[PDB]
């Protein structure tokens, strides 16, 4: 939970970046 | 063969079509949007009226998740539930260390996202 925190946060940032990048796309047909 | 107003939702509000009539066609759909605290969950953020006067959807909005707030030098960040919207984490110190500051934080809406209500404490003395 020192480096697991870093791992999670990173994953999050990607997932967040993926989340709407995906959606902004499916929205944009 | 008729459904009234949409049920309001905890997680999403409608995309503004506010010029709405008293009920809605027995086949109409409804474009929605996630509320503060929530992110888009499925391909389809939508309600829909079936042939028999009901409203139907799959939950298309889920609790957004917070960052993990990092190491607490000489303490312990303990996740009760998880790190997503609405959930508490607790702080506690070890050994002789007393904790100063908040003993809890909650994933609250912050900005257009979701942060921790209380800042990290110092675990000292």
Residue spans per domain, chain B: 1-63, 64-125
Resolution in A for the shown PDB structure? 3.0
Please state which architecture CATH assigns to domain B64-125.
Answer: Ribbon (2.10)
C-beta contacts of B50-57 below 8 A and 24+ residues apart? B50/B3, B50/B26, B51/B1, B51/B26, B51/B27, B52/B1, B52/B26, B53/B1, B53/B2, B53/B3, B53/B4, B53/B26, B54/B3, B55/B3, B55/B6, B55/B7, B57/B32
3-state secondary structure chain B: CCECCCCCCCCEEECCCCCCCCCECCCCEEEEEECCCEEECCCCCEEEECCCCCECCCCCEEECECCCCCCCCCEEEEECCCCECCCEEEEEECCCCEEECCCEEEEEEECCEEEECCCCCEEEC
| Two domains, one topology: B1-63 and B64-125 | yes
| Fold for the domain defined by B1-63 | Complement Module; domain 1 (2.10.70)
What is the pairing mode between strands B61-63 and B88-93? Answer: unpaired
B40 to chain A, any CB pair closer than 8 A? The answer is: yes
Rounded to the nearest 5 degrees, what angle is found at the Cα of B10, between the Cα atoms of B8 and B107? 160
Whole-number Cα distances in Å, B100 to B57, B115, B120: 46, 20, 9
Q: Report the structure determination method.
A: X-ray
Which residue from A minimizes the CA distance to B72? A2
Which residue from B minimizes the CA distance to A2? B71
């Amino acid at each position: 939970a020192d480096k697991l925190a870093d791992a999670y946060n990173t994953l999050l940032t990607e997932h967040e970046k993926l989340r709407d990048e995906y959606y902004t796309l499916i929205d944009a047909k | 063969s008729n459904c009234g107003p949409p049920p309001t939702l905890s997680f999403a509000a409608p995309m503004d079509i506010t010029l709405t009539e008293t009920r809605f066609k027995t086949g109409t759909t409804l474009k929605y949007t996630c509320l503060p605290g929530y992110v888009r969950s499925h391909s389809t953020q939508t309600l829909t009226c079936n042939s028999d006067g009901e409203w139907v959807y799959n939950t298309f909005c889920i609790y957004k998740r917070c960052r993990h707030p990092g190491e607490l030098r000489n303490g312990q960040v303990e996740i009760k539930t998880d790190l997503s919207f609405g959930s508490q984490i607790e702080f506690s110190c070890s050994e002789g260390f007393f904790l100063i500051g908040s003993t809890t934080s909650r994933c609250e809406v912050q900005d257009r996202g979701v942060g921790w209500s209380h800042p990290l404490p110092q675990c000292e003395i």
